Amino acid sequence: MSIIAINENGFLDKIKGRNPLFTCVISSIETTLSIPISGVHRDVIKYTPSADVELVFYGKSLTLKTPPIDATGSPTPATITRACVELKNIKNLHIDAGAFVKPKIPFIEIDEKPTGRIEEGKAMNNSKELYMKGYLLGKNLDAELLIVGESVPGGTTTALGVLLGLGYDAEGKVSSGSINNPHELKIKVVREGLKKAGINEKSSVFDVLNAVGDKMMPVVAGLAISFAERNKPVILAGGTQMSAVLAVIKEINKKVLDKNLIAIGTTEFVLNDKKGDLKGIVEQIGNVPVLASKFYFEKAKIEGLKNYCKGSVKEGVGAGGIAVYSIVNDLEPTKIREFIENKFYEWYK
Amino acid sequence: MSIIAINENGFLDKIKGRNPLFTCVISSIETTLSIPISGVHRDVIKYTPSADVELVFYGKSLTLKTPPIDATGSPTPATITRACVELKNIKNLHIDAGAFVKPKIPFIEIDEKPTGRIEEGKAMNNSKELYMKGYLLGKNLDAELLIVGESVPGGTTTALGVLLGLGYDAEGKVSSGSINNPHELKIKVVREGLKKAGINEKSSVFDVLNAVGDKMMPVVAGLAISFAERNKPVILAGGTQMSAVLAVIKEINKKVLDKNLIAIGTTEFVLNDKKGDLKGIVEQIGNVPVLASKFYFEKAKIEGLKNYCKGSVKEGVGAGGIAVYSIVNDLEPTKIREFIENKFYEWYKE
Ligand SMILES: Nc1ncnc2ncn([C@H]3O[C@H](COP(=O)(O)O)[C@@H](O)[C@H]3O)c12
Ligand SMILES: Nc1ncnc2ncn([C@H]3O[C@H](COP(=O)(O)O)[C@@H](O)[C@H]3O)c12
Ligand SMILES: O=C(O)c1cccnc1
Ligand SMILES: O=C(O)c1cccnc1
């Protein structure tokens, strides 16, 4: 039907009828101000993480007059996430780990300062502290299931860097937030940063994150470990970015990862992206469920949604994973498309 | 039962066996740095709201070297709140509505800017927006019971100003965070602010808050209404400050008080404060439960706790209300005193 499952291993039955909390962890990356690594449109990238979570939580962007778009003009995947929050009454609370511009909605502040210059190997100096903060926050969140997404423009580059720094075969395998995927530029950036920071086989996961990660990653790892340690399921709601978070979790607490309570929840558009290879990254990390939602956007009435099928946007803001939860719990998939179609005119003017 | 109850109305049964979320809403008031209205010690007042929630959430204050103290040197009531969250495994997540210096723990940011000059009638310009933010946040907090506290040094003064601005008889009835309760100074501050802002019987509740409230108040009112509207109980965990919040709630949504889902949870020290009159404020607002926890601090080894019985500190950081929840759910009250005594050296090196 409307969920594509790889290595499902009973995970879907652990989430049917369970009470979720959705949280999106946001960050900005200083590199994106000067180097065109991101597929988010340059005119909105500084405002995109906060505008995304404003749309999800409040129903419209406040930091921008219309919600964000990718380079090809397709709408933010926060449109999908908002549709699911409304259609399934999903409680949502969002976390800042360094957006350039902060949300105008209530939000959880973990670190005001953006992710740094990846090409200098100076992403952050505090990845262990951010992990600890995500874990301690997670212990105070009460839900039966955590659905944790991201909005980090540039985050497919940091995902590549972290996977490479940990020793995985990831060149050419990470996705992009738009149709074009400038792999040569991304490799140049992360290889430079890994070299400058002296990353090698002996480096710890926190050294790798400090060099070329983004600040969302340790926070999400902490939240996820806090839930799985308590025997609660977690959907890492994202694409190849969440494969990097999964690799980080394996380095921090493999025993918790081995409980089989953590899955990747993404979209059909990422799973079927021929310019990357999500399934192939995950195979290197472990036997972890990969679940992808189908949207039937080929027959959407919004051209920008039809363009997801060509590679525009694909994923983000937890869209794929929140849709997996929603569809497993009985939401008819075309209700997502119809919701967006209904709200699109007022959102985009 | 170690609980003093006024107009209980069966509320104690609504909180027994329910899973709580504890949240402390923090703010700072610009007036407190210029005029000595607060009972929090002037050396630490700027840092107190954030140090309080750091103690509760993490177990250590992180900018201050030790936790806060009142003007007499007695320990912050966050000691009680920390004891309860540990002893009863209470989940907690704290909210900033304008502390001067922010927490170093994760926290929910609602408004970074402090509450302004009460004596100028310029507390804030955005009470309506702050109410809506607390309301929408509350819809996204999943708990069976909300325990909502505050840490707002100077908050007994803004409580007096809001109560007077709404037309209550409140002079001499608000409490104080230390032994001295400077009623004549407080009344001058708030009546000057009310006059400057032009507040009268035609003003809205948001006009009153914009003149002389603190930013915690509309946030808490929104949180509380969001829960009670959903048929869930709320403990307003504070003293005379929460009576002002209750009056705000009545102005915004009086019918929600008819559900009997909102109670004030405070300490014996506030209820029995002979320099204030909590019961006499609440009687003017409505038939709302007022529940007060007993601590048996007369028998403590630490002078700082014994001083609560003489009027030091009294309440704050949700201590009274979280203790009401804990005692109703079978916590032996003296385990609080004992926990504090056991950690006092780690916290204060005394
Ligand atoms: N693609 C997107 N388009 C419009 N709005 C978006 N908000 C998030 N994303 C998504 O794309 C970004 C990652 O892709 P890259 O590495 O190319 O920047 C993240 O922000 C992700 O959430 C968006
Ligand atoms: N009294 C206190 N002493 C030490 N630390 C405190 N933290 C909060 N309070 C408490 O006292 C303050 C209100 O009293 P006033 O209007 O006199 O300032 C609030 O901060 C309240 O939480 C404290
Ligand atoms: O692979 C990802 O994580 C991804 C792809 C497209 C857009 N946002 C994220
Ligand atoms: O009356 C109050 O609200 C109060 C009294 C003392 C300390 N904190 C609050």
The answer to whether the beta carbons of residues A26 and A50 sit under 8 Å apart is yes
- For A252, phi and psi rounded to 5 degrees? -85, -40
Chain B CB contacts of A106 below 8 Å: 95, 108-110, 133, 136-137
Q: Is the CB of B150 inside a 6 Å radius of any atom of ligand 4? A: no
Map tokens 């509740």 to a residue.
B205
Interface test with A, best of B22, B109, B147, B232 (most A CBs within 10 A): B109
Per DSSP, the three-state class of A111 is strand
8 Å CB contact of A106 and B110: yes
Token readout for A256 is 């918790």
Chain B CB contacts of A18 below 8 Å: none
Ligand nearest to the CA of B56: 2
A102 vs B44: CA distance, rounded Å: 29
- For A24, phi and psi rounded to 5 degrees? -105, 130
Distance A155 CA to ligand 3 centre (A): 8
Chain A CB contacts of B91 below 8 Å: 139-142
For A130, name the nearest residue in chain B, comparing CA atoms only.
Answer: B106
Largest CA distance in chain A: 53
8 Å CB contact of A91 and B57: no
Contacts for B265 with CB less than 8 Å, ≥ 6 apart = B147, B235, B236, B237, B238, B291, B292, B293, B320, B321, B322, B323, B324, B325
The answer to whether the beta carbons of residues A82 and A24 sit under 8 Å apart is no
Per DSSP, A265 falls in state: E
Q: How does A198-207 read in b/e, with b if 16+ C-beta sit within 10 Å? A: ebeeebebbb
Selecting from A91, A96, A133 the residue whose C-beta is nearest the C-beta of B140 gives A91
B155 vs B237: CA distance, rounded Å: 14
B225 vs B208: CA distance, rounded Å: 19
Q: Does A89 touch chain B (CB under 8 A)?
A: no
Token readout for A316 is 């983000």
Q: Is the CB of A111 inside a 6 Å radius of any atom of ligand 1? A: no
The answer to whether the beta carbons of residues A57 and B136 sit under 8 Å apart is yes
Q: Does A5 touch chain B (CB under 8 A)?
A: no
8 Å CB contact of A102 and B109: yes
For residue A97, which of A224, A237, A218 has the smallest C-alpha distance?
A: A218
Per DSSP, the three-state class of A5 is strand
Map tokens 């906060």 to a residue.
A50
Q: Does B19 touch chain A (CB under 8 A)?
A: yes
Residues β-bridged to residue B265: B237, B291
A112 vs A125: CA distance, rounded Å: 13
Amino acid code (one letter) for B262:
I
The answer to whether the beta carbons of residues B103 and B95 sit under 8 Å apart is no
For B58, name the nearest residue in chain A, comparing CA atoms only.
Answer: A136
* Residue B133: Cβ within 10 Å count: 24
Chain B CB contacts of A89 below 8 Å: none
User: What is the dihedral angle through the alpha carbons of B24, B30, B34, B36, rounded to the nearest 10 degrees?
Assistant: -30
Q: Does B139 touch chain A (CB under 8 A)?
A: yes
B83 vs A253: CA distance, rounded Å: 30
8 Å CB contact of B142 and A137: no
User: What is the dihedral angle through the alpha carbons of B316, B317, B323, B324, rounded to the nearest 10 degrees?
Assistant: 70
| Dihedral sign, Cα of residue B211, residue B213, residue B219, residue B221 | negative
How many Å lie between the alpha carbon of B73 and the closest alpha carbon of chain A? 31
A78 vs A54: CA distance, rounded Å: 9
For residue B111, which of B122, B95, B123 has the smallest C-alpha distance?
A: B95
A128 vs B74: CA distance, rounded Å: 35
Distance B239 CA to ligand 2 centre (A): 11
- For B31, phi and psi rounded to 5 degrees? -55, -35
DSSP track, B5-32: EES-TTHHHHHTT--EEEEEEE--BGGG
Expressed in angstroms, the distance from the first to the final Cα of chain A is: 35
* Residue B159: Cβ within 10 Å count: 32
Per DSSP, B40 falls in state: B
Residues β-bridged to residue A96: A26, A109
Q: Does A21 touch chain B (CB under 8 A)?
A: yes
- Residue A147's H or E segment, with its range, is strand A145-151
In chain B, breaks (C-N over 2.5 A) are found after none
Q: Does B259 touch chain A (CB under 8 A)?
A: no
The answer to whether the beta carbons of residues B218 and B123 sit under 8 Å apart is no
Token readout for B73 is 């040197």
Distance B14 CA to ligand 4 centre (A): 25
B296 vs B302: CA distance, rounded Å: 12
Mutate to test the pocket of ligand 1, among A50, A151, A157, A181 (most ligand atoms within 8 A of CB): A151
Interface test with A, best of B55, B140, B216 (most A CBs within 10 A): B140
Distance A292 CA to ligand 4 centre (A): 53
DSSP track, A8-49: -TTHHHHHTTPPEEEEEEE--BGGGGTS---SB-TTTGGGHH
- The experimental technique behind this entry is X-ray
- Residue B244's H or E segment, with its range, is helix B240-252
List domains and CATH numbers for chain A.
3-348 (3.40.50.10210)
Question: Which numbered atom of ligand 1 lies nearest the CA of A69?
Answer: 4
The answer to whether the beta carbons of residues A178 and A76 sit under 8 Å apart is no
Map tokens 């994202």 to a residue.
A238
